[PDB]
């Protein structure tokens, strides 16, 4: 019975309310994202609870600009909040500099926002881990954040249920050199490793990032591609 | 029994115990009823003298909020005074902004939002009041509303607030309420208040009756109760 709340350190350890938010992230819906040579592939795992829900209303894959994709693994109600913050911030950058914002500067400022919520002492942290990507100046990128304010840079990663198992498959399956199609193939493979047995044109939801810009794929080509891709 | 401390927190079964405890605070307060007729709304409050120290004409729970609206409060009196001032302020804003008399639905909704806003946060407590709101208009008829301590505000024909909440409406509802003008309803409310608690727990009480409708041409004031003296010459005929 301690820590409680956000203003004071432990006797020796860490920030238990951030560790619990990370556990709530790890208890979330799975996702996978892979940086290839020319593009970046994002893929989530979106199961409706009943047969009643519609798949055209809520969207996991969400663009920040015309060339910057972003998925998560956590809670949509906080996700939309920090999405809207990132929207307004990226449009403020484009007001200041009249140039589309680079992804490193996005990740700096979004990390500053999340860090400002981790400061004391009445607000809770986000239960949201991001996977940010974009194609700025030829070389595409991939940046994962976390509730603690930190950030990383990945070649391919995963987040959600069985991220450890999916990551051990990613270490074996993926490599340095692929194209976007082979990236989607290995991405649906590593998401199909951990998802339920019935995977359709609606249970997944996939957006890509070519150098020609962000592209959020449709259920038509998603159903064409995952119609027993291997 | 918890977890009953703050007004922001929920329970393991999902309700706010602060609101319940504030609701049953008014249960110990004096009995106050109300009923409307086809051309007016009549109030009536069982009011008690402490022992012999009062003046029969102090601290009247029958307030007078707008030109055609008044309260029939019961519970903590000063909280009701502050809430009456807020209601006067809201009717003031409406009269200043739109040039005509406030409809009672809109007034009741603003007051319900104000009471709900005092039930929301953790710094403040919920109100300890439960009051009545009556009105009359030439294009609207008679309207009688009702606000609980929580902030649920809807409409009635008759109501009761106090100890005998059920024990008044047991014989309120056997009144032929539609076909009567309110001048009968005056002595009707007199007999209803006079039925409950003559001498049993306390020693003596005293009656006030408020009065709005078409007969006042849209005004709201206390009856000249001494005029027509309708309680006692019928109260002494209501014991048998």
């Amino acid at each position: 019975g301690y820590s409680f709340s956000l203003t004071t350190f432990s006797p020796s350890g860490k920030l238990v309310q951030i560790e619990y938010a990370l556990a709530a992230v790890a208890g979330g819906a799975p996702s996978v994202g892979i940086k290839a040579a020319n593009g970046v592939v994002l893929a989530t795992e979106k199961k409706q609870k009943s047969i009643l829900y519609d798949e055209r209303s809520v969207h996991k894959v969400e663009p920040i600009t015309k060339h910057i994709g972003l998925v998560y693994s956590g809670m949509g109600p906080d996700y939309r909040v920090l999405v809207h913050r990132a929207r307004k911030l990226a449009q403020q950058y484009y007001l200041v500099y009249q140039e589309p914002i680079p992804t490193a500067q996005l990740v700096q400022r979004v990390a500053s926002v999340m860090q400002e919520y981790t400061q004391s002492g009445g607000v809770r942290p986000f239960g949201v881990s991001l996977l940010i990507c974009g194609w700025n100046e030829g070389r595409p990128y991939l940046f994962q954040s976390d509730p603690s304010g930190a950030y990383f840079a990945w070649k391919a990663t995963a987040m959600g249920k069985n991220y450890v198992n999916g990551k051990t498959f990613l270490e074996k399956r993926y490599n340095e050199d692929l194209e976007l199609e082979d990236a989607i193939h290995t991405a649906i493979l590593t998401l199909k490793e951990s998802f339920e047995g019935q995977m359709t044109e609606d249970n997944i939801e996939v957006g890509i990032c070519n150098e020609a810009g962000f592209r959020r794929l449709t259920p038509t080509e998603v159903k064409d591609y995952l119609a027993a891709i291997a | 029994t918890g977890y009953d401390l703050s007004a922001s927190t929920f329970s393991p079964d999902g309700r706010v115990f602060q609101v319940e405890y504030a609701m049953k605070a008014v249960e110990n307060s004096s009995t106050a009823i109300g009923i409307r007729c086809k051309d007016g709304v009549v109030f009536g409050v069982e009011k008690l003298v402490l022992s012999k120290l009062y003046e029969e004409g102090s601290n009247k729970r029958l307030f007078n909020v707008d030109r055609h609206v008044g309260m029939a409060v019961a519970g903590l009196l000063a909280d009701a005074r502050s809430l009456a001032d807020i209601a006067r302020e809201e009717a003031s804003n409406f009269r200043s902004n739109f040039g005509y008399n406030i409809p009672l639905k809109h007034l009741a909704d603003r007051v319900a939002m104000y009471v709900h806003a005092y039930t929301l946060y953790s710094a403040v407590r919920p109100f300890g009041c439960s009051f009545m709101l009556g009105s009359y208009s030439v294009n609207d008829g008679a309207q009688l509303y009702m606000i609980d301590p929580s902030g649920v505000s809807y409409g009635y024909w008759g109501c009761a607030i106090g100890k005998a909440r059920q024990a008044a409406k047991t014989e309120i509802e056997k009144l032929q309420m539609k076909e009567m003008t309110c001048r009968d309803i005056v002595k009707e409310v007199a007999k209803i208040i006079y039925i409950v608690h003559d001498e049993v727990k306390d020693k003596a009480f005293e009656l006030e009756l408020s009065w709005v409708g078409e007969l006042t041409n849209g005004r709201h004031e206390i009856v000249p109760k001494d005029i027509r003296e309708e309680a006692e010459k019928y109260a002494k005929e209501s014991l048998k």
Binding site: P63, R87, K88, Y94, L95 | -
Partner: protein
């Protein structure tokens, strides 16, 4: 400065002339006066240039933000409401003479904005200093529901008359055509005024100017 707008049978054809004068001297011969708002809505500015520029970039940012939050194509009336509310909020201090045009789901909609906040929906507008000549050509030869090349010839003719009247431009009149599906944008449309060829050669020589102090700094 002479900008114009029109509505043909499907969409909107806008024109402009690109002489950005600073006082009494021609300071520019090529100034993009047709500004971006959205993939379907565009805007033109007149009068104070930087006011029109900053305002149209702010409103384009706000509509990009709203459209990406919503998830569908923007409406022209929202842009109109933001612009008139902003310009009334500045009380007519900012001089920004705007022409607003776009094609929604409802179709083509043209608005002209006067810098206090007075707006109008019109089939054809002219704005600027030499707007009167283009409005002359419009009032002479306009008919409702023209075709494409007809409307292009009319707007080109109007801005050409504005150039043959005073304070037009040397420039090769800029046009832009918005339809329900097809957006086009044409900078070097028609060049009437070629620069006269040099008759000699006022070229300097390697050393015709006395030099007092040199410096060399290498780089990478």
């Amino acid at each position: 400065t002479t900008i114009a707008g029109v509505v043909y049978k499907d969409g909107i054809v806008l024109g402009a002339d690109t002489r950005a004068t600073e006082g009494m001297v021609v300071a520019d011969k090529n100034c993009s006066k047709i500004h971006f708002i959205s993939p379907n809505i565009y805007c033109c500015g007149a009068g104070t240039a930087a006011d029109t520029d900053m305002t149209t970039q702010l409103i384009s940012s706000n509509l990009e933000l709203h459209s990406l939050s919503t998830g569908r194509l923007p409406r022209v009336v929202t842009a109109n409401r933001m612009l008139k509310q902003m310009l009334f909020r500045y009380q007519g201090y900012i001089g920004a003479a705007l022409v607003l045009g776009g094609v929604d789901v409802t179709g083509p909609h043209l608005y002209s904005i006067y810098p206090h906040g007075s707006t109008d929906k019109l089939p054809y507008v002219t704005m600027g200093s030499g707007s009167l000549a283009a409005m002359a050509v419009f009032e002479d030869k306009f008919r409702p529901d023209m075709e494409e090349e007809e409307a292009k010839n009319l707007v080109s003719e109007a801005i050409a008359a504005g150039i043959f009247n005073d304070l037009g431009s040397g420039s090769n009149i800029d046009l832009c055509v918005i339809s329900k599906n097809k957006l086009d944008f044409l900078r070097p449309y028609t060049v009437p005024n070629k620069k006269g060829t040099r008759l000699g050669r006022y070229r300097c020589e390697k050393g015709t100017t006395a030099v007092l102090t040199e410096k060399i700094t290498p780089l990478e």
